[PDB]
Every structure is written in C-alpha cells, then in structure tokens.
Amino acid sequence: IEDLMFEMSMWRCNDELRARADEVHANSRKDAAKHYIEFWKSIPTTEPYRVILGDVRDKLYHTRERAHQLLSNGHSDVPVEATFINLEQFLEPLELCYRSLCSCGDRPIADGSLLDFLRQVSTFGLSLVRLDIRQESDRHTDVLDAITTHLDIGSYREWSEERRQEWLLSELSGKRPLFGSDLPKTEEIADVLDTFHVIAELPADSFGAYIISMATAPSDVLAVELLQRECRVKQPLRVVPLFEKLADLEAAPAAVARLFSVDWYKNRINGKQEVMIGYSDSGKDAGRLSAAWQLYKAQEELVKVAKEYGVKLTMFHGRGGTVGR
Amino acid sequence: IEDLMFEMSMWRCNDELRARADEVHANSRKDAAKHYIEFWKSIPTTEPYRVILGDVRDKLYHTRERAHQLLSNGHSDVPVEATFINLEQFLEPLELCYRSLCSCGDRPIADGSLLDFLRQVSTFGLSLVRLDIRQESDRHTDVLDAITTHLDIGSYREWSEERRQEWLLSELSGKRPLFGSDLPKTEEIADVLDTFHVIAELPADSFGAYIISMATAPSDVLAVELLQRECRVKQPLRVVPLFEKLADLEAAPAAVARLFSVDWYKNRINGKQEVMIGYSDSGKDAGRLSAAWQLYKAQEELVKVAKEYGVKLTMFHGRGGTVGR
Numbered sequence: 031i032e033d034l035m036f037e038m039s040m041w042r043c044n045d046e047l048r049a050r051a052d053e054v055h056a057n058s059r060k061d062a063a064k065h066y067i068e069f070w071k072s073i074p075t076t077e078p079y080r081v082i083l084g085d086v087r088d089k090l091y092h093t094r095e096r097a098h099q100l101l102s103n104g105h106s107d108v109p110v111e112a113t114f115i116n117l118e119q120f121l122e123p124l125e126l127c128y129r130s131l132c133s134c135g136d137r138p139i140a141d142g143s144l145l146d147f148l149r150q151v152s153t154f155g156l157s158l159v160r161l162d163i164r165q166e167s168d169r170h171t172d173v174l175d176a177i178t179t180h181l182d183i184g185s186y187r188e189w190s191e192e193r194r195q196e197w198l199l200s201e202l203s204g205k206r207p208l209f210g211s212d213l214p215k216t217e218e219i220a221d222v223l224d225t226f227h228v229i230a231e232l233p234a235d236s237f238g239a240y241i242i243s244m245a246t247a248p249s250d251v252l253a254v255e256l257l258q259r260e261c262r263v264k265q266p267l268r269v270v271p272l273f274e275k276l277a278d279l280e281a282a283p284a285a286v287a288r289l290f291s292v293d294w295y296k297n298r299i300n301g302k303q304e305v306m307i308g309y310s311d312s313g314k315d316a317g318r319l320s321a322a323w324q325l326y327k328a329q330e331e332l333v334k335v336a337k338e339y340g341v342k343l344t345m346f347h348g349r350g351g352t353v354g355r
Numbered sequence: 356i357e358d359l360m361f362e363m364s365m366w367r368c369n370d371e372l373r374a375r376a377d378e379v380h381a382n383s384r385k386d387a388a389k390h391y392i393e394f395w396k397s398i399p400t401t402e403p404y405r406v407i408l409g410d411v412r413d414k415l416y417h418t419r420e421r422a423h424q425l426l427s428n429g430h431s432d433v434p435v436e437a438t439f440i441n442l443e444q445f446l447e448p449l450e451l452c453y454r455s456l457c458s459c460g461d462r463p464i465a466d467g468s469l470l471d472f473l474r475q476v477s478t479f480g481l482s483l484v485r486l487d488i489r490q491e492s493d494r495h496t497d498v499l500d501a502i503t504t505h506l507d508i509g510s511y512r513e514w515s516e517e518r519r520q521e522w523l524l525s526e527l528s529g530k531r532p533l534f535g536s537d538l539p540k541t542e543e544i545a546d547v548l549d550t551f552h553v554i555a556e557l558p559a560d561s562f563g564a565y566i567i568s569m570a571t572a573p574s575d576v577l578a579v580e581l582l583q584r585e586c587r588v589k590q591p592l593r594v595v596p597l598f599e600k601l602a603d604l605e606a607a608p609a610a611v612a613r614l615f616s617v618d619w620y621k622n623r624i625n626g627k628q629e630v631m632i633g634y635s636d637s638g639k640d641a642g643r644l645s646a647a648w649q650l651y652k653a654q655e656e657l658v659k660v661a662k663e664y665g666v667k668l669t670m671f672h673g674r675g676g677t678v679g680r
Binding site for chain 1: 534
C-alpha cells in the first residue's frame with residue numbers, strides 16, 4: 031500500500047473523490063503518527079488519491095496488528111471498526127480511485143499498479159484462500175444419534191432414510207433449540223460440534239464449502255445444515271457431497287435429484303449447487319477404464335438433474351497428479 | 356479482623372491448628388506486604404492463631420477488593436480463589452481457632468471477640484442480608500404465553516389449569532431447552548427473563564426466596580420453577596406464593612394442597628415449603644375483624660395441609676406497623 035500511495039500523486043479527481051478526500055481530511059487526526067516510516071505527516075488534500083489510500087493504509091495497519099494479536103494471544107484490543115471487516119469495505123476506496131482516474135482521463139494510470147492491487151484484493155480478499163471443511167457422514171450421524179438418544183426420541187442411526195428426512199426437516203423449519211449445554215458428547219462428537227463453533231466464531235469470508243465424505247442420502251446434507259444452524263453459524267456455508275467410490279458415483283444423480291425434490295432445500299439453495307466428484311478411489315476397486323467412463327456418465331446425468339431442477343450446478347473434481355487418481 | 360488478630364496472641368494450640376499454621380507459613384509469601392498497615396511482616400509460627408487469622412485477613416482483603424471492582428466497574432481481575440466464595444470457607448479457619456482454644460483450656464478467650472466474630476459471620480454471611488425477589492403471576496404467564504405462541508404450540512393464557520400442568524410437567528421433566536435467543540420479548544418479558552439472568556450470574560447465598568404475587572394455582576409456582584431452570588439458574592431459589600386479598604386467603608389451603616399433590620413438586624421441595632400471608636389488603640376489601648379472623652383460619656388450615664403432606668411449612672407474615680395492616 032505504501033508504494034501504491036507513492037505512485038498515486040495526481041491532483042485531479044472528480045467531485046466525488048474530492049468530497050470523500052475532504053471527508054477523510056476532516057477526521058485527519060492532526061497527530062505525529064510516527065509508527066509509520068513514510069507519510070507520517072497528515073496527507074494534504076493537494077494529492078487526494080494519497081488521502082484516500084492513506085485511510086486504506088490506516089485500516090490495513092490495524093487489520094494486520096489485530097490479526098497478529100488474535101493469533102499471538104487469544105484476543106486483541108484493536109477495535110473492529112478500525113480494521114477492514116468487509117470483503118469490499120477494502121474495495122470501495124480503491125474502486126473510487128479507479129473511477130476518478132478514468133473520469134479525469136487517466137485510464138492508463140488506473141490500469142497499472144492500481145489495477146494490479148484491485149485484482150489482488152478482489153481475487154485474494156482479506157484471507158488469501160477460502161478454507162473448506164471436509165468430514166465423513168458417519169461422524170454427523172454419530173452426533174445426531176447422540177442428540178436423539180439424549181432427547182429420548184429414538185436412535186437416529188436405527189432410523190430409516192424417510193424418518194431421518196422428516197425429522198431433520200421438522201427441526202430445520204422449527205424454532206426451538208435442539209441440544210443444550212448438557213448433551214453427552216464423545217471426543218469425536220465434541221470434535222465436530224467444536225469445529226462448527228469455530229466456524230461460527232470466525233468471519234464468514236474465511237471459509238469455503240463443507241464437503242461430506244461418503245455422502246449417500248439427502249439426510250447426510252440436511253444433517254450438516256441442521257448442525258450448522260444449531261451451532262449458531264451466522265452465515266452457514268454451502269454443503270457439498272463427495273461421491274468418490276464407484277457405487278456412489280453410479281447412484282449420485284438419483285441422490286442429487288432426491289435432494290432437489292425437498293422444496294425447503296431447493297428454496298434455501300438459491301438455485302446454485304456444488305457437488306464433488308472424487309477420482310482417487312474409483313479406479314482402485316474397479317477398472318481404470320470403467321472408472322473413467324462411469325465418471326463421464328456421472329457428470330452428464332448430474333447436469334441433467336440440475337437442469338431438470340433449474341439449479342446452476344458446479345462440479346468439484348477431486349483430481350490427482352497421477353493418471354491413476 | 357485486625358483487632359481479632361491482635362487479641363489472639365496465644366502460643367498453645369492443638370496439633371491440628373499447629374499443622375494448619377505450619378501450612379500457611381509454608382506458602383507464607385515472604386514479601387514486604389506493605390499494603391497492610393499492621394502485621395505487614397510475615398507472621399511467625401510462634402503465634403499460630405495470628406498466622407491463621409492473618410490468612411483470613413488476606414482472603415477478606417481480596418474478597419472486599421473483588422466485590423468493590425465488581426460493583427464499581429463490571430468485572431474484576433481479582434482471582435476468585437483469592438477470596439471467600441463460600442458462606443463457610445470463611446467459617447472454617449475461625450472454627451479451627453475456636454476448637455484449638457477450647458482444647459488448650461482457653462474457652463473463656465474463645466468466648467470473646469472470636470465468638471462474636473463467629474456469630475457475625477454465621478448470621479450476616481458474605482452478603483449482609485439474603486435478598487427476596489417478588490413478581491406478580493401475570494408477568495410469568497405473559498412470558499410463557501410468548502414461548503408457547505413462538506413455539507407454535509398454542510396459547511398458555513388460553514390454556515386451562517389442567518393443560519398448563521401437563522405441559523409444564525413435561526417440560527420440567529424434559530431435558531431439551533425451551534426458548535432461544537430469538538424469542539420475541541416485550542420490555543416486560545425481557546424484564547422477568549433478565550431478572551432470572553441476573554439471579555443466575557450472582558452468588559446463590561446472596562438471594563432468598565422468589566415470591567409470586569396473585570398466586571392461585573400450582574401452575575403459578577411450577578411456572579417460576581420452569582423459568583428458573585430454563586434461564587440457567589444454577590441454584591434455583593425457592594418459590595413462595597403470596598396470599599393477601601381476602602379471597603386468596605380463603606382459597607390458599609386448597610391451592611397449596613393442590614400444589615403438594617404434584618408429586619414431582621413435592622419430591623423436589625425437599626420437605627420444606629414457605630408461603631407468604633399478606634396483612635395489608637385483607638381489612639381493606641372486607642372488615643378488619645373478618646380479615647383478622649380469616650387470616651387466623653388460613654394459617655390454621657395451611658398448617659393442616661402441610662402436615663397432611665409431611666411438609667415443614669414456614670409462613671411469611673407480611674405484617675405492617677399500623678394495626679390496620
């Protein structure tokens with residue numbers, strides 16, 4: 031950000047960027063600001079891009095220091111309002127700089143370091159990569175079984191698929207909390223519950239998808255939707271099944287179609303669905319040729335199902351480096 | 356405590372108090388300890404009573420400092436283990452001094468400042484007076500009605516007594532949480548829920564009994580028991596009905612008996628029940644004579660009911676200063 035500030039040394043801007051830079055110069059904090067090396071003096075309105083990018087630098091400094099304390103210790107005293115919390119609270123001032131440069135005839139300048147920086151922000155965001163969480167279905171089933179046994183309503187393991195679907199739907203659409211503080215948990219059960227709490231505690235733009243290993247039925251997805259909602263995950267991440275064994279690839283389109291049949295899920299999925307297609311285990315239990323061919327069929331009929339339900343399907347290919355995977 | 360340390364200057368003690376004073380002198384913190392005025396030097400084991408009482412001074416000093424921060428601000432950094440948390444963590448060292456003094460033939464010394472201090476501790480405790488909470492029945496009914504309506508299960512107001520009893524019993528014996536964070540509350544609903552949260556946050560020995568105004572049915576008491584359990588009140592306070600108007604004094608024995616009939620409640624009541632008897636309003640709607648006489652009869656038949664259920668009834672007389680109340 032400091033090198034970008036050094037380059038944006040123009041003095042022409044729109045009335046818009048002028049007004050905003052005047053706003054920042056109002057709350058300019060006439061102070062020493064000696065913790066910085068460069069630009070430690072209050073930036074004059076003569077160079078407005080430097081004013082705005084100066085505020086971006088301040089919020090960057092406090093974002094870095096906060097994350098540094100949050101990591102080093104367990105907490106930070108840095109105010110959240112002093113940092114960049116949004117994916118595009120960051121982008122807004124830089125977008126404004128770009129509009130300014132273009133309006134004033136400086137599109138060549140804008141398509142330089144400022145464009146490089148814009149693309150880096152809009153490509154990497156505040157956390158370089160969005161993290162996926164993957165977990166096998168049987169662990170979610172163990173959790174739910176603990177929940178139904180503790181609630182004295184049956185054993186979710188012993189329940190048929192129909193029963194699991196009806197129950198999970200009633201809880202997802204219901205408004206009463208499920209388990210409580212006094213739910214008996216195993217180290218495994220507490221592992222998955224605690225990963226959901228960690229997911230809830232952290233910013234939403236830090237995570238990607240929740241991938242279900244050995245996913246076979248809609249109850250496996252709905253279980254994760256419910257456990258997320260119940261662990262107070264403010265912005266729940268999308269659920270995506272992983273079909274890697276040949277048997278699961280053969281029956282995948284049917285399962286996805288049955289999931290889209292559930293009106294509640296199709297209404298909450300918002301017309302977009304991602305499903306993962308594993309490549310490692312397919313060519314291990316069956317032939318490599320049969321595996322590849324079945325993979326082709328799988329993609330084809332999954333697209334057929336998604337088109338049949340008006341859902342934009344994006345498929346997640348778990349490809350390896352070796353042809354065998 | 357300092358004047359008490361000054362008197363307890365004996366040098367004979369039992370082996371018990373000897374061992375304990377040696378323990379305290381082991382972790383004696385060989386420091387300046389200049390924050391005290393008197394006894395700032397580590398107390399020698401020659402005067403063991405002063406050793407022990409000196410530690411009581413340390414825990415009183417930190418108990419006071421913690422309570423002072425907790426009051427002044429919202430929190431305290433004073434470790435809880437540095438203070439007296441129990442009503443008789445305080446009493447134990449003093450009891451030890453008393454047993455020691457008696458064993459060594461100094462019961463007369465023990466029956467002086469130390470016995471006064473024992474009585475003051477055992478009578479005033481860590482909070483000079485135990486605090487009662489009083490609230491009218493209708494406010495608890497408003498809360499529960501909000502909960503059943505939000506759970507889309509009916510209207511607790513419109514429900515008959517029978518139905519309220521069945522529901523309240525199933526929830527009191529059930530293990531699943533009731534309402535959640537998203538329950539729509541009025542300022543009144545939030546008032547009673549928040550008084551329950553405050554009660555849960557504060558020490559148990561700081562509160563007394565929860566008095567229900569305009570109490571008429573077993574559902575009124577069970578309602579408060581449920582709200583306490585559901586607001587995570589660790590040690591729930593005893594529920595006590597208030598019969599003050601002449602009609603309610605007339606119907607009190609029946610209502611208390613109907614309450615004792617709920618075996619779940621009589622088994623949790625632990626053989627003890629307190630019921631309040633108001634004196635102000637009776638002689639206002641009826642005569643003073645009829646009120647006095649009705650009060651007498653009510654006391655008489657409440658005792659009969661409690662004896663019939665093997666419950667030690669203690670009655671709380673809401674007497675005034677003026678003969679009319």
